[PDB]
Amino acid sequence: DVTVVYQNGLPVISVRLPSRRERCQFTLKPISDSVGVFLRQLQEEDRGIDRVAIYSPDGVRVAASTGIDLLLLDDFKLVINDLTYHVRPPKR
């Protein structure tokens, strides 16, 4: 359900937000954006989000200050309220 696709060289993360049926896509800058930036953009898009967090595939919380480029080196878990998505970005 959450996909990562590069378009024009930048990662586009498409997510299903809880308040809406229509997917929402987030383009990020891997060199400047952080995990915390992405999670804040999610919260700004949907007031129905009470909790967002990103974890490693082993289940360890990823620091907010971590660069998006580092996040997208491997799979990760994105928690939105009570749903956990396994995100599998393409290797770069």
Residue numbers in the entry: 74 to 165
How does the study describe this entry?
The principal components of mtCU are the pore-forming, mitochondrial Ca2+ uniporter (MCU) subunits that oligomerize into tetrameric channels. The conserved Asp-Ile-Met-Glu (DIME) motif in each subunit forms the Ca2+ selectivity filter at the intermembrane space (IMS)-exposed channel entrance by symmetric arrangement of the four subunits. Indeed, we and others demonstrated that binding of Ca2+ or Mg2+ to an MCU regulating acidic patch (MRAP) on the NTD destabilizes domain self-association and inhibits mtCU activity.
The C-terminus (i.e. residues 166–189) is not resolved, suggesting the region is dynamic under our crystallization conditions. Notably, the residues that make up MRAP in human MCU-NTD (i.e. D131, D147, D148) are not fully conserved in human MCUb-NTD at the primary (i.e. D116, N132, D133) and three-dimensional (3D) structural levels. Over the 1 μs simulation time, this single Ca2+ ion underwent 95,239 total interactions with MCU-NTDWT, with ∼97 % contacts occurring with MRAP residues D131, D147 and D148 (i.e. 29,851, 29,594 and 32,478 interactions, respectively). Collectively, the data suggest that an ∼10 °C increase in temperature favours MCU-NTD structural stability and decreased dynamics in contrast to MCUb-NTD, which is destabilized by the higher temperature.
